[PDB]
Amino acid sequence: GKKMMTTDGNTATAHVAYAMSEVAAIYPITPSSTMGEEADDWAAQGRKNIFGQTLTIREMQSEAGAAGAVHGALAAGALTTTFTASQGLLLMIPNMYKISGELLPGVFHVTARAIAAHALSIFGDHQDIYAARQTGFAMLASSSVQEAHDMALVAHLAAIESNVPFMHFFDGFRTSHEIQKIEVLDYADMASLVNQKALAEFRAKSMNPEHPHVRGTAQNPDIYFQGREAANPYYLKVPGIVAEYMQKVASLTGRSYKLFDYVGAPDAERVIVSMGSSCETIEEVINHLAAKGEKIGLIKVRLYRPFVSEAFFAALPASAKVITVLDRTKEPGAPGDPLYLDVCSAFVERGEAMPKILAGRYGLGSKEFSPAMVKSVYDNMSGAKKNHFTVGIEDDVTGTSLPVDNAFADTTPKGTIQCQFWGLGADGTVGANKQAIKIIGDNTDLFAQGYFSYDSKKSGGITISHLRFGEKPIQSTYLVNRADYVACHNPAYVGIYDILEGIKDGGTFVLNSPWSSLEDMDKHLPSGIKRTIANKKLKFYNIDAVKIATDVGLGGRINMIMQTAFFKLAGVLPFEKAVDLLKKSIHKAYGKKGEKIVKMNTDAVDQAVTSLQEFKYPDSWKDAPAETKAEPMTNEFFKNVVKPILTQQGDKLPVSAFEADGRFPLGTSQFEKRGVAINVPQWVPENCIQCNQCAFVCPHSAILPVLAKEEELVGAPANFTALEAKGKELKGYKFRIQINTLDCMGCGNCADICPPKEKALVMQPLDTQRDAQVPNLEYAARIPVKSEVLPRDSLKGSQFQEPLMEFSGACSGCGETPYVRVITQLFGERMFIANATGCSSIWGASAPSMPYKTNRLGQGPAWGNSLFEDAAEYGFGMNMSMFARRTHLADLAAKALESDASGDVKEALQGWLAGKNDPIKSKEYGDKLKKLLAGQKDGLLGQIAAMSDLYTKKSVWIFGGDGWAYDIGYGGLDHVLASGEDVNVFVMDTEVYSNTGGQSSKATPTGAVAKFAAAGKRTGKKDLARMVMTYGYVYVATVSMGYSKQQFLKVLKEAESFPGPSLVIAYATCINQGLRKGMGKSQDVMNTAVKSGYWPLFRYDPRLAAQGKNPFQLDSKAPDGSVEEFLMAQNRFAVLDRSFPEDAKRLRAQVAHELDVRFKELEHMAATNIFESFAPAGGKADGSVDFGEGAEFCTRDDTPMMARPDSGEACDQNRAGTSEQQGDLSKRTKK
Template sequence: MLLSGNESSTYIAYKLNDILFYYPITPSSPMSEDFEKKALNGEKNIWGRIPLYEQMQSEIGVAGAIHGSLQTGVPTTTFTSSQGLLLMNSAMNRIAGELLPTVIHVASRSLGYQGGNIYGDHSDVMSLRHSGFAMLCSNNNQEIMDFSLIANTLTYLLRVPFIHFFDGFRSSHEIVDVKLISDEQIVKFFKASNFNNFYYNMPNNQFPAIRGAIYSSDIGFQVRETINKNYDRLPIILQKLMNKFEKLTGRSYKIFEYYGEKEATKLIIIMGSASECVKEAVDIRNSKYKDCGVLKVRLFRPFCVDFFIKEIPKTITHIAVLDRTKEIGAVGEPLYQEVCSAFIKIYSNKKLNSNFPLIIHGRYGLSSKDFTPNMALSVFNELDKKNPKNTFTIGIEDDKLGLKYTNIEFKNDLIEVLFYGLGSDRTISTVKLIINNIFKKKLYTQTFFEYDARKSGGITISHLRIGEKTFSKPYKIKIADILVCNQFYFLEKYSLVDNLKKKGILLINSSFLENKFNKVISPLTKKKIRDKEIKIYVFDADFISKKYKQKISFIIQIAFFYIMEKLEKRIFNNSKDSLIQDTIIADIKKSIYLYNIIKTNEPIKQFKQSKNLKELMSENLGDLIPVHKFRKDAIWEIEPTYEFEKREYVDKIPMWNPNSCIQCNKCVFVCPHGAIRSKIITKKEKKNIFYDFNSAIALDDNFQFTQNEFIIQISPNGCVGCELCIEVCPTSNEDEYSIDSLIQIEKKQILEKEEGKWNTFNNTIVESQKNKYIDKIKNTQFIDPLFAFSSACAGCGETAYLKLLTQLFGSRLYIANASGCSTVYCANLPSIPWNKDTNGKSVVWSHSLFENNAEFGFGLKLGIQSHKKQAYELLSTLKYDNIKKEILNCIDFEKQEQIVNKLNKTLLKKENCLNSKKLLKISDYLIEKSLWIIGGDGWAYDIGYGGIDHILNKKEDINILVLDNEGYANTGGHTSNSTPLGAKMKYSLEGKNISKKNLGLLALNYSHVYVASIAMGADAEHTLKVFKEAEKFKGPSIIIAYCPCITHGYNLKYGIEQQEMAVKSGIWPLYSFNPDNLIINKNPMNIYYEPDLSFLNKYLEKEKRFTNSIYLIELYKDFIEKQYKKIKNIQDFYNLK
């Protein structure tokens, strides 16, 4: 059966547990999703029960819940990765100390060091090797299934808990054929577990006992040593179980397993999926030298020296130990330390008959860096040397420690295919459909998917291998037989032809058909295609999909099988409407064109050889960047790299018609990507511009004509086609006779001219109207944002809030950002969407973790205060009390900046004064800073709520902005405590059965906190008012912002309309509570909405997450009435007061 590693793990975990506690974290979340689906489908475990499953607010909660459940004798599990595992650490110590049996399944993933990282290595599990949990590693998907059963059996037999781990993404998301273990086999094998002894013999009221007592110093040491025998016996019993498993299934395993020549002299010791790559390298090398082998490590804790040394040939003289983690300051990484310690122990006990081998160690595969047989061969080559490197890295360009390797293509009988697509363009779904069709025909496949951190719009690369026999190649395809490209502009941007073998096939989805195709590709690409004799097939999937009313995934499948002649006849044979289907397929094939690249004398453009880091990363060439090119401290300077994030896949973009525009600037305000801008310039300035811009006579706030010109300009490659601007435009679709101010037009018709106009508009037209009287939304939009062209989804409901923050508070902004969508689109290298103002200043943006963002922001605030205090003290020391007084009395932040700039010029003249130099370094802190703690609802309502509550209970001037899209969007749309009643999301597939947490009302328990609930699409002026009030308020403030999201299940071009419906119906409240009003004897609670239940059905019906809107209406009526009454009661309370 075709299964991913995650599915293989869940298959067994579901059958051998009664309870799952979980919390979403990439790449382990699919395991919990799969568990939930099985339960909802009524599947039963081996005891005939449907397991319970419960989402917690964080992994700390998960670990605590597991501990409690295990205390009652109930089999309980979880799935996790990375920081999630580390948050369980303390509870895991207790679980292991109390000998409570469980298996935690880990899709191992990098920890965050210099920055956030969602990719795979062993740094998470290796950080828990002291926990007391046994650690069992699976190398492939079959082992994941098999070892899940073995670990679950052994944990009850010895009462030692297990971490069962496998490589995140490489194994967790790889899809291969896995042989299932039947229920009968599971029951038969699990009988050895002594499970009933655990299930029926835990303390209860009839047999009372206490657990978790406090030990005194006189007995603590002794108690800690009581568990030794359990761990000493574990390797022996584990091997016996593996032997028993072989008799049951025919699959043989050892806790340490050697592969290679019997009298080998060179050995690589490794664990995880990379061991399969080393195995392949061993075969290649031994075909010539017959001198090497590989030792696969499966049981890492407890590390059994006797089993270890028994498996190694006595002829071994040179050993390389490879670790998939980095341990700063240690003699070596964890596996290397264990190997060295094992040999020392054997040697000191005189059990080693031969000489002590030479042992070197290396690091590989951090953050999912690919590891290949060629790299393994280079390690063996290093062992050949007289003086090999003691410590090395492999797989990266490392000037000091790196081993060089050659990418040699080894012949095989496989068909290797690469699919390039965009996140959410269904390329990955298509590949999954293709492999299922291939698998039905008894061919073997291996599929691996590369993602970036974005949930849509990021590049995806699918690696598919097809063969007649079983095979294992857990590494990426570098050069493919066939390359399928679902986005035309990838062809040039990523030089895709370089990834094809000679006489390979390129299948490309493009609207440039017939003669147009030859015209739009560069001379260099044409030359490469001719030199490699590549066949090119072009088809327009969007056009074909509309013509035949078929899904794009269906079209791509047909096109793919069409070019693979041997497989073509094997598809879709089981269709019920085979005659109709055959007709459609035949017609679609006629729409697939085979092209010959015409040889021309076009000059080949010479690209610059020297590219900076971000340019290389943007072209998917990060592997070529050497270690020394990066900064050590993880600081990335803000420079105009946001241009890299401009996505060119949109066919149509809006064009502005000045004749019907009313100059409201709503289109500019709602644009999530800052791709549409407005400016006011003088007529004289317009004459000096090269391009002839469309313009209108500028209107003032009272809609009276002025002497200036009003311009709107769209960035054609920056626009992502969300159409929010068109939907929000007051002139759009007014009536059949009206002329729209924004109309959609084919981009290719106007691209070159409009891009030139955009560059002129953006780079040479200075912000001539710096209207600081920002009392209206219209006027805020004349200010250039410092946030634009992010990697957020088209129509994202979050980014316009951040854009507005930069327009209001500009280069005074400090942002502490929680993990989630906002982290990804705010700083997803190489694209940084932040820009500098005309003075070269910008936002200071920082990110720590998911769970601690509020506290992280609090630390930033106190740090800023400390610098500010020091700066004022230096002003006094230098006798600048007049300047100090001037700054303190100045409430205009722009004037503050002018005073500080003038001060800096004075300080520069005093080169020999130490205090002047010190003040010059920190004088910027004399300008009042605007600190914002920002994150999504997963952070604010769940994992970080405790931190938020703690900060609100302070009196520091801190602003919190909650971007509430009512779910864990970046993990793929999982339920949070903000998910509304009845909404269907992952982890609540039947609809959430409880109302969302009311974060605003909870915050209103503090009378000293500014609290507001906003929805920019429903009331833009209220949003502006709240932002300004919160920033002005000298205390803690929290703003909860409604954010439409693709996880809500509707076209986000209607996001503004949905916000209006949410507010009008009363589902989403608009209010602000401003404690400053109490000082001037005003009611602090202002309400800006009144529920009208007639809009409720319209709101619910629009979103696919609410599937049973008729049933929900009655429930929501009650919810809306109660919510409004609570908010009104607060207003009434202060009226009475």
């Protein structure tokens, strides 16, 4: 049986993957997490595979552990699979050779994603899949959603019968997240294609002590080579098995395929050879140009490996005179990319006709591949014939890109309605778009396509959706730039984004805004927009969805109003059936609360259909006066690079506009001033007590405390109200808390924690503050920061320091940024950061916004993100460099001390040398030296001068999340902390893989609800703190800002100052945890976290042990009993109590017990007078000694492994018994 189904690549292949698999070991990673999360859910729900069994899915610590688990399963006789991508696929490589080597029917479903080189990317291309092309895996590619399903089935069937592992792959995001109405097969149909004899043999040859065998042997040069060729027969037959099933799945669905498929003109002279979702668009362009008489074609490659040349030439037209192979990868240095090379070897080996063959690279990192680009490619063949060209960018540095005429006529099928939606994150737009897909598709005989472009901004971001509808198949695997319907669901975008680009003439444009009058419309709508609305005779429909949404009592949410706009003006369904079929869905969804809520969404539909009246704009718009420019201060980087990017114009940014090594300058987020908050805090100098707690808490540094004297507040606004500093050091100074209304995300934390009964901070509408604050901020921002007035590491004094990390892309009230910010206020000027992959690297390094900044001297955190699994290692590397280099300096300094260096130079040189590793001193004598050696450029001194950036002691930090620390990168973390070296790791524990969807980590508590914890995690929270404390010499400590900022500053001090390994774990609230009262209660929740005893604070300081003192110190008090109310306040716990109350009660009970036992444990750990000692280092002294020297019996074996240059000496190999035994045998044979 069949079944029309509208879904995306991920769900489409996952549907087939689940049915054909008994075991699955996965690890989350964008954009394959979906599939992995599908399986788990479906299994939990009770889904059955073709064996009537629910899939057994487990989560590992990494894709390496995954691939390893799969191997074991496959070896143990179970049909296994896994879903991965990019960085994840790279860590599976080693196992892949093993899995292929041991001929196992394994199958990988990977969403082709870019590899992180100059920069990380979560978008699609073939860099990863190509990196595994020599693992011995079969590679079957799909070019569409429908194909995703189809090729996914063939993959499994072929694998089972070929005993050769398959890698089914499809374009990440471009196919995986694209939704289309496709056909899927029943689990029964699939199960009936399986080769039973093969399945029986697979299980019979598998590992089992009832009939064991040995795999994974170690072979010498005598047999390795032969054993490696022993599988040739298998690889020769796989192409046949693959074709076989393409024909069998064909007899059931009606969709045929070949290892290589040809499309286009029978006598095409110019053929393209591509692979992936790109082929869909090519064919679209082919149908258009070929119908016009053009002789061009295309060869779709399905099976990339093995690469059967026969099948290639099968789909290749003899009329082909020129054929360009397109690779969606980039192998620096190669003479050509993958596919290109394979194709070349094809013709050369055919040793006959030789058609001009061109090479072309495209789509890197989901780069758009428009029909125009497909046009540019076919023209290059009938023209310049440029080779090794790029398409989609402007290569003005090496000039390899192709000229693209964007004025290319639309090639979408006839009768297709392409739509565009510009919504704000969380307004319902997308969810409403997806509903419009299910409805229309499941009630009409139209094809539906959906794709969405989100924003790097986790809060208040733009979301331009793309939807298409037609009577003919949709092959438009690229954005919509010729829409018939354009809708802006946010009036803010009006004057900041090119909302109407390429909008077809006569096209309708419905806008969301309270400008129902022409006066307002003209006052807020730009001339460029007005001019366009008129010149194109657009059918502009305004609508006050907010007002209309308030009259019906929908809270004011415009999601159900703009949805009604679509069905009425998009023109896909007849007005009647269109609006009618909608009301039917209103009942489908919702209905969560009687007909009351259902009535509010029905009334909205009608009153809206009424409000939806064309805005009769005047013909005077055709020539409206364009305003004048007035952009504030900015760099030539925020102006020439970041803004063009922030304004969705980055694609037009040529190659020459970037750093070859892919680096960015700091403080670029200093001009973003997004201003997407709804409500902001209002300082009230009548209640304020000048404590600096509001600033200390802000997750975006949107609060700037000002401490200046009337000497600096001369040319200031009359409303720059300022109190008079409180305290001793603060007497004549004037205090003030300047709210940064534009950079504020309106989370509410500051006001929520402001001490005084009568809050000195009150939340008010942004617009009712900006006009008076923005100008005061630009002023207060010019007031010198008083850093030498109070103790740098003091609560009230730390906020008088410069925050070198502001306005990041983190969510409102993030539980992470608050910490890092204050961390820069203590060491920022002299620290390195090795940020592990994840949120910490997302809200801090997502181009083009860079929150980290430099202070008044240009000093700031030297930031860097290597990978997700090597944060510690990475940072450990930075530590080795500094050591190696600083030690170098010190040795030259010593040299100069013996030379004829001046008296002054020798003093500072002598001094620095004494405090080389002392922040204060190293900086005191370091600066003196700079002054003294200034201008020097010869001899030792000349070299010592050129190293001023090594003088003051640097501070190396490792930023990561629980996922990194507890899982993927725990191994490196553990190892580095053992190194016993001066490094500082800061773990922001959100108890869950955040930015990837909220997957369960070993840091996730008991009974918590996360991905792969679908019913509350049934394993206790891994105790990372106690595990590392066992080292004895590693400084460990836990913190929780909301509970005690004072203890947090102390920790940072004691940790960073410790002359060795430091591990600090911070309890960070996150939106994945789902706080009932919002992230504005984050600080108050961190507080409860400690009091309840859920997250007890403590510190293990080894140097205390070095002085007879117990290295363990408890910073919190025994549980208070508010634990239950603490867990039930977070949805990640409340959900179970609603769906599975029985397990919920038990799980929350087990947790309380868990924290009750562990605390008593910590207490006794703080009471005991028995602890591990501590010793820095000392000793070394040049000289090495091998463990073999002076040994009586051999210390090494005969093996080629222990063999060394100096080895080979005669020794007692222990084959004559013991020394005594030998001695006695000698006495027992006297003679």
